[PDB]
């Protein structure tokens, strides 16, 4: 259901069953018992419920907000423009928080899946999380509990002044 591009899953490499002993593997019998006593009734119930859902098929939509002029293109006391820009900035802040959440989910999934080789096999995920975390900390950090778009603008201006000072040295 979820876009596999957003949440990448490596191809599943499952070893084939190659028993060498002649003893009856209790795991196989237990799995068959489970599939007979739980899976079948659960699947039948899900089939019934999915039929009922398909009988009454309705839709819900993802609301899309158009881009609005930022706080940079906003007069000193233009309360209307400032309100629009502040709402857009808060929406962007929420979206960036969710982006960081997605990256963290990727990192956790990689850490669990790779088992004992997570340190070497999740370097790419660690790098992606480091990049996103540094970007987020540069943008949304130290603002405080009363953060506003004007405060990010001020922090960005301070950072750009520091960059200019470094470049001129």
């Amino acid at each position: 259901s979820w876009d596999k591009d957003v949440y990448p899953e490596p191809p599943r490499r499952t070893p084939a069953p190659a028993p060498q002993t002649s003893l009856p593997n209790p795991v196989t019998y237990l799995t068959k018992i489970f599939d007979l006593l739980v899976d079948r009734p659960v699947t039948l119930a899900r089939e019934f419920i999915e039929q009922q859902h398909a009988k009454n098929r309705y839709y819900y939509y993802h609301r899309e907000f158009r881009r609005v002029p930022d706080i940079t293109e906003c007069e000193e006391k233009d309360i209307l423009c400032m309100f629009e820009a502040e709402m857009q900035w808060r929406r962007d802040y929420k979206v960036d928080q969710e982006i960081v959440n997605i990256i963290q989910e990727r990192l956790k999934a990689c850490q669990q899946r790779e088992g004992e080789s997570y340190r070497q096999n999740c370097a790419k995920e660690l790098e992606q999380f480091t990049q996103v975390s540094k970007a987020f900390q540069d943008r949304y950090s130290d603002l405080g509990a009363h953060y506003s778009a004007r405060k990010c603008l001020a922090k960005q201006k301070q950072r750009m002044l520091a960059e200019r000072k470094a470049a001129k040295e």
């Binding site: 400032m82 502040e86 709402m87 808060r90 929406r91 405080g144 509990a145 009363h146 506003s148 004007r150």
Partner: protein
């Protein structure tokens, strides 16, 4: 917002024109209905606040408090039915109307869009409270308690009035939205320092800062049960809400001016928890526990980090519920033994079993047992303060340890041991008291399933 204000006002003629056998019933019915209606205010938007009109608005901070007040009014009525049973009809109606006026004033404080209207109503809350404390209190100390409380609040709040009017004159408006958008940094001049103080001390008095907390024990001990309930559940959170609202125009001077208050609260939590360890009055122990809990909210507000504000809101709601329930339990014990001495009546775990379970659960919530919202708030504030400074963890852990110690000490002293031999008037707990405790506890436990509701606007 008038959908809640108008029925609250209509409660008064209803109670005044109701038969003497139906004041409590009608009051409970319609206060519960008002709370049910006010539950609709919890549908807060992610970014923008709910601006009903030019005068009233509500965000993810105001809505939980409004719901708490509308829910606490019926609880206060149920708790105050008992001792106000032999009173005359007119005085019972008067008491109910005082409670209703207090609730109405609290609603209009939590919804006000103008800082001066907020101040007017938040100082108007004094009159019903003071009357309740000095008229229906049982002891002779209710007169001094009312004065201490009233004068502490007024001496804190009058400079706030001066500062608010000065800000109105200088910036042109006191509306929360405008004062938030048109915000400007405060310089390090002495004038800005004293404006910061004038704005801060008023709410520091309300939620008792260590040193300005002397009025809270007197007020909570001498007042009747319902009065203590409001004073502990809402009238302390008024200061926290006001501080979280006004800290928008007090930056960046707070960074440097918060040190005295931060240190005062971070030491007063330990001091008041230790005081609870050595208390002889149950209500005084609960009041000092309230002081210790509100010290954390003071710290969280004075740190001004998103996690600190979320923890502050959660702790405010949780502490209000827990303190109200603890005061109700102490009231039941008092109405049974007619004394507030903790060591007087012992071994109540064998005479009132369900009341013992209520005490146990209330104490567990008080000591921040996971996954209660008390712990959610405390842990958020602790993490915020640790990020502020790693050294804070020592005081936070010591405070948690002492809180657990004194809460379980209260539980052991009251609901454990050998029963008091001579006491023979302990009757089986009524359905009303058990229902009161259940209505105190069940929302508290349910909020842990949806903590997002009481985590404030920064969630």
């Amino acid at each position: 917002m008038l959908k809640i204000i108008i029925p609250t006002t209509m409660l008064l003629p209803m109670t005044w024109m109701s038969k003497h056998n139906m004041i409590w019933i009608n009051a409970t019915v319609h206060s519960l209905l008002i709370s049910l209606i006010s539950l609709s205010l919890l549908n807060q938007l992610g970014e923008n606040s709910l601006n009903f009109s030019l005068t009233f608005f509500s965000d993810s901070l105001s809505a939980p408090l409004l719901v708490l007040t509308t829910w606490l009014l019926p609880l206060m009525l149920m708790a105050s039915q008992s001792h106000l049973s032999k009173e005359t009809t007119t005085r019972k109606k008067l008491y109910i109307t005082m409670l209703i006026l207090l609730q109405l004033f609290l609603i209009m404080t939590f919804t006000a869009t103008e800082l001066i209207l907020f101040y007017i109503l938040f100082e108007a809350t004094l009159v019903p409270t003071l009357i309740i404390i000095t008229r229906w209190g049982n002891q002779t100390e209710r007169l001094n308690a009312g004065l201490y409380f009233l004068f502490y609040t007024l001496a804190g709040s009058l400079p706030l009035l001066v500062a608010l009017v000065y800000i109105q004159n200088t910036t042109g408006s006191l509306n929360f939205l405008i004062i938030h958008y048109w915000s400007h940094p405060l310089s390090n001049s002495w004038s800005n320092i004293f404006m910061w103080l004038a704005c801060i001390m008023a709410f520091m008095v309300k939620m008792p800062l260590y040193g300005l907390h002397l009025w809270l024990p007197k007020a909570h001990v001498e007042a009747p049960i319902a009065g203590s309930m409001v004073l502990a559940a809402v009238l302390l959170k008024l200061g926290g809400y006001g501080m979280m609202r006004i800290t928008t125009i007090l930056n960046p001077l707070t960074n440097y001016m918060a040190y005295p208050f931060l240190m005062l609260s971070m030491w007063g939590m330990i001091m008041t928890s230790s005081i609870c360890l050595r208390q002889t009055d149950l209500k005084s122990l609960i009041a000092y526990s309230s002081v210790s809990h509100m010290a954390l909210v003071i710290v969280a507000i004075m740190i001004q980090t998103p996690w600190s504000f979320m923890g502050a809101t959660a702790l405010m709601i949780a502490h209000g519920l827990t303190s109200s329930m603890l005061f109700c339990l102490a009231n039941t014990n008092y109405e049974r033994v007619h004394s507030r001495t903790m060591i007087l009546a012992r071994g109540l775990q064998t005479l009132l079993p369900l009341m013992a379970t209520w005490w146990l659960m209330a104490s567990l919530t008080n000591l921040a047992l996971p996954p209660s919202i008390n712990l959610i708030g405390e842990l958020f504030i602790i993490t915020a303060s640790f990020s502020w400074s790693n050294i804070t963890i020592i005081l936070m852990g010591m405070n948690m340890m002492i809180t657990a110690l004194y809460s379980l000490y209260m539980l052991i002293t009251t609901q454990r041991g050998k029963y008091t031999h001579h006491i023979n008037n302990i009757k089986a707990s009524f359905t009303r008291e058990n229902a009161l405790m259940a209505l105190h506890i069940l929302p508290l436990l349910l909020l842990t399933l949806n903590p997002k509701m009481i985590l404030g606007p920064l969630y």
